[PDB]
């Protein structure tokens, strides 16, 4: 009965029928995105209306459409034709992944380039790569993918070990035309294989690892009700799933005595971009918005018990739409479990004689997605002490190139003749805050050093300062690790027992933000990535930091346009957008398959509670 329940197969089938009956889902139509809309502000009406938003592509060249449907009432709420030269192209379709390779295989320019390299066209894989917006005037308003080639020596071979450098092609996937083939010269195709399951490469497998058995003989400590509502160790929340964003957390609250206290209304990773830093014209256009262009939720893996998730696991299997509106289940796509997390609190007192130890634990909600060469794990953690943490785990296979004779300032060498271009993986977390309710504000907190002198005669004092962000035009902030900078989200109308406003502190990892030149195409299209923290006033239609249609959008959509409204954010319904990322100079140890590297952020209570919230944890 909850409005935040996962989409059902029946709901998706009804959407299909509504669209079909309205004449919106003919044979030339494809669904590029379908998702449930969240309830509007003021859901205390109990009048449920389950609405779905749909992006509809047309493979014959007609204008695409954005459609909103009510499954509760069986009606089309609105349908708008999109001018894609203005507002952006629709996300990449899974069925387009093979179209680039197929169109190039019959193009004489492509074939002549492969012939010069003595490459069999049947062995050449072409990656379907988003195009961005650069100097090519003929691409405006056309649906373009770019292709880079990799050789597979046999069907089970890792093509990533064999990049074909000096060659790139651009394809119009609707008109089925190859617009440009660019061949800058012949590079040797690296010959070593990268087959990490080949015994010749792994050697004999270790026989030294003994089993670790993690079991819960009384079952888990959390309960799941209504399909996706979690209660665990005073936490309460709803686990949603969206095909663009992936796992979304709703209604994060903490039961403090008799009161359920809200903390976060909605938490998601609302964008992620992978900019490459190789200036070669073969790759200098590469910036993959894995979320906004490809939709990370639709490529979520089915997670295997014992391998991907270990322990007493509870699965959710979210349902999404395929390109024709049929429901499709991602079996075991979300893992949920609790984990021991070491010592929570400990003290042995010299005067009272009391020895005290308590153990910590965390609740884990996770999924894994695969986008071409990349594989990303998204982990949300809830801790006993009120801490909330997000962690991204990056693995998969690095994107490769030739390594130029004489070296490179922008590419790492991994194997003889094999390179990996420098790049970043940058995430945007969208945190619709609700600290004890919706009246919130953000303060920037810096350490303050003090000069030795009167009132500080021994030169030991230090302090802190807090600056309230009052308007959106002043709420675009940068990290400063040297001054210990953090941000506090507080509720000025809700005080703790010491009469101080309750709050939560955001702790960033302070990694570099977007490195590209500020005049670049990617700096305009991924403006969110140039700053660590943005605060906006909540609005229904301000969902993504890059706007609704990221593919081939010319730039400036999303956060820079939102904050131009300069709205009041001092004790208001606000949204925090936190940029964080990994800067990846690939190492030899990343090849042929990359060990996990991680990045994230956390929020800790800051005077939210009247004392430690874990005094009632028992002694194991």
Catalytic positions: 290, 374
Distance CA 164, CA 172 (A): 21
Interaction with its own copies in 456-495: which residues (CB under 8 A)?
456-464, 479, 481-484
432 binds its own copies (CB under 8 A): no
Binding-site member from 87, 511, 554, 572 for its own copies (CB under 8 A): 511
User: With respect to Cu ion, which residue has the nearer C-beta, 337 or 584?
Assistant: 584
352 binds its own copies (CB under 8 A): yes
Residue 373 annotated as binding site: yes
Nearest approach in angstroms of CB 602 to its own copies is 11
Interaction with Cu ion in 570-589: which residues (CB under 5 A)?
584
**Contact partner at residue 203 from Cu ion, Na ion, its own copies, none, CB < 5 to 8 Å by partner kind:** its own copies
Interaction with its own copies in 187-226: which residues (CB under 8 A)?
196-197, 201-221
**Contact partner at residue 1 from Cu ion, its own copies, Na ion, none, CB < 5 to 8 Å by partner kind:** none
Nearest approach in angstroms of CB 167 to its own copies is 18
**Contact partner at residue 584 from Cu ion, its own copies, Na ion, none, CB < 5 to 8 Å by partner kind:** Cu ion
Task: Determine how many CB atoms are found less than 10 A away from the CB of residue 188.
Answer: 13
Distance CA 370, CA 127 (A): 14
Distance CA 256, CA 268 (A): 24
Nearest approach in angstroms of CB 260 to its own copies is 16
Distance CA 506, CA 487 (A): 5
Task: For 470-538, list the strands marked E by DSSP.
Answer: 476-477, 486-495, 501-508, 533-537
User: With respect to its own copies, which residue has the nearer C-beta, 42 or 453?
Assistant: 453
Going from the C-alpha of 221 to that of each of 363, 380, 388, 501, the distances in angstroms are 9, 17, 18, 32
Residue 371 annotated as binding site: yes
553 binds Cu ion (CB under 5 A): no
396 binds its own copies (CB under 8 A): yes
**Contact partner at residue 554 from its own copies, Na ion, Cu ion, none, CB < 5 to 8 Å by partner kind:** Na ion
315 binds its own copies (CB under 8 A): no
**Contact partner at residue 522 from its own copies, Na ion, Cu ion, none, CB < 5 to 8 Å by partner kind:** its own copies
Interaction with its own copies in 365-394: which residues (CB under 8 A)?
368, 370, 372-373, 375, 377, 385-386, 393
User: With respect to Na ion, which residue has the nearer C-beta, 22 or 86?
Assistant: 86
Bridge partners, residue 479, by sequence: none
User: With respect to its own copies, which residue has the nearer C-beta, 40 or 481?
Assistant: 481
- Please report how many Cα atoms fall inside a 13 Å half-sphere around the Cα of residue 317, on the Cβ side: 9
Nearest approach in angstroms of CB 32 to Na ion is 19
Going from the C-alpha of 179 to that of each of 104, 105, 140, 309, 406, the distances in angstroms are 10, 14, 13, 45, 33
Nearest approach in angstroms of CB 3 to its own copies is 27
Task: For 349-485, list the strands marked E by DSSP.
Answer: 355-371, 374-383, 388-396, 401-402, 411-415, 418-421, 423-433, 441-449, 462-469, 476-477
Distance CA 431, CA 603 (A): 11
Q: Footprint of Na ion on this chain (CB under 5 A)? A: 432-433, 538, 554, 573
Among residues 475, 433, 468, the alpha carbon closest in space to that of 608 is found at 433
Under 8 Å CB-to-CB from 397, ≥6 apart: which residues?
158, 160, 194, 373, 592, 593, 594
Instruction: Give the DSSP letter of residue 369.
Output: E
Residue 288 annotated as binding site: yes
Which tokens in the block code for residue 612? 């430690």
Distance, C-alpha 480 to centroid of its chain = 24
Residue 356 annotated as binding site: no
User: With respect to its own copies, which residue has the nearer C-beta, 1 or 205?
Assistant: 205
Nearest approach in angstroms of CB 583 to Cu ion is 9
Going from the C-alpha of 334 to that of each of 107, 196, 303, 364, 380, the distances in angstroms are 42, 27, 7, 10, 11
Among residues 536, 593, 473, 617, the alpha carbon closest in space to that of 197 is found at 593
**Contact partner at residue 433 from its own copies, Na ion, Cu ion, none, CB < 5 to 8 Å by partner kind:** Na ion
User: With respect to its own copies, which residue has the nearer C-beta, 398 or 569?
Assistant: 398
Nearest approach in angstroms of CB 452 to its own copies is 4
| Known binding positions for substrate | 288-299, 371-376
| Known binding positions for Cu cation | 423, 425, 584
| Known binding positions | 288-299, 371-376, 423, 425, 584
């Amino acid at each position: 009965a909850s409005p935040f329940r996962l989409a059902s197969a029946g709901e998706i089938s009804e959407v299909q029928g509504i669209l079909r009956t309205a004449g919106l889902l003919g044979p030339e139509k494809r669904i590029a995105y379908l998702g449930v809309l969240d309830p509007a502000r003021g859901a205390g009406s109990e009048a449920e209306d389950r609405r779905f938003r749909v992006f509809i592509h047309d493979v014959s060249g007609a204008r695409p459409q954005e459609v909103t449907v009510s499954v509760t009432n069986g009606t089309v709420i609105s349908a708008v034709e999109l001018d894609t030269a203005a507002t952006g192209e629709l996300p990449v379709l899974e069925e387009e992944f093979e179209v680039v390779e197929q169109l190039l295989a019959t193009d004489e320019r492509w074939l002549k380039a492969l012939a010069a390299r003595n490459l069999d066209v049947s062995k050449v894989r072409v990656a379907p790569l988003s195009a961005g917006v650069f100097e090519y005037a003929e691409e405006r308003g056309r649906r373009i993918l770019r292709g880079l080639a990799f050789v597979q020596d046999f069907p089970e071979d890792s093509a990533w070990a064999h990049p074909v450098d000096g060659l790139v092609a651009y394809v119009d996937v609707v008109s089925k035309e190859v617009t440009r083939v660019i061949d800058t010269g012949v590079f040797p195709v690296p010959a070593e294989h990268g087959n990490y399951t080949d015994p010749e490469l792994t050697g004999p497998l270790r026989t030294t690892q003994k089993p670790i058995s993690i079991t819960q003989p009384e079952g888990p400590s959390f309960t799941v009700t209504g399909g996706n509502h979690i209660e665990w160790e005073k936490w309460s929340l709803d686990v949603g799933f969206d095909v663009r964003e992936g796992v979304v957390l709703h209604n994060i609250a903490f039961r403090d005595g008799d009161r359920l206290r809200p903390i976060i209304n909605r938490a998601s990773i609302a964008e992620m971009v992978v900019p490459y830093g190789d200036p070669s014209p073969i790759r200098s256009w590469q910036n993959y918005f894995d979320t906004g262009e490809y939709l990370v939720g639709q490529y979520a893996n089915s997670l295997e018990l014992g391998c991907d998730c270990l322990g007493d696991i509870t699965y959710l299997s979210p349902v999404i739409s395929d390109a024709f509106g049929n429901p499709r289940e991602i079996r075991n796509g979300i893992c949920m479990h609790e984990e021991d997390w070491g010592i929570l609190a400990k003290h042995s007192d010299l005067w009272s004689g009391i020895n005290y130890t308590r153990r910590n634990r965390r609740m884990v909600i996770s999924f894994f997605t695969t986008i071409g060469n990349y594989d990303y794990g998204f982990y949300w953690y809830l801790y006993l002490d009120g801490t909330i943490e997000f962690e991204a785990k990056a693995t998969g296979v690095v994107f490769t190139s030739a390594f130029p004779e004489g070296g490179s300032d922008n590419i790492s060498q991994l194997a003889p003749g094999l390179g990996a271009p420098f790049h970043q993986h940058i995430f945007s977390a969208r945190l619709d805050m609700a600290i004890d309710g919706f009246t919130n504000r953000v303060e920037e907190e810096d350490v303050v050093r003090q000069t030795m002198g009167p009132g500080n005669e021994r030169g030991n004092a230090f302090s802190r300062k807090r600056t309230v962000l009052t308007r959106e035009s002043e709420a675009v902030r940068e990290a400063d690790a040297r001054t210990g900078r953090t941000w506090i989200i507080s509720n000025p109308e809700s005080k703790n027992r010491l009469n101080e406003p309750v709050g939560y502190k955001l702790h960033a990892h302070n990694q570099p933000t977007l490195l590209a030149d500020p005049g670049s195409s990617i700096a305009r299209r991924a403006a969110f990535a140039t700053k660590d923290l943005w605060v906006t006033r909540y609005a229904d239609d301000e969902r993504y930091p890059t706007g609704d249609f990221v593919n081939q959008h010319s730039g400036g959509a999303g956060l820079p346009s939102y904050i131009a409204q300069d709205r009041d954010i001092d004790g208001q319904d606000i949204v925090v957008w936190h940029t964080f990322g990994l800067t990846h100079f690939p190492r030899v140890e990343d090849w042929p398959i990359m060990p996990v590297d991680t990045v994230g952020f956390k929020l800790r209570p800051e005077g939210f509670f009247d004392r430690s919230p874990v005094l009632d944890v028992p002694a194991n």
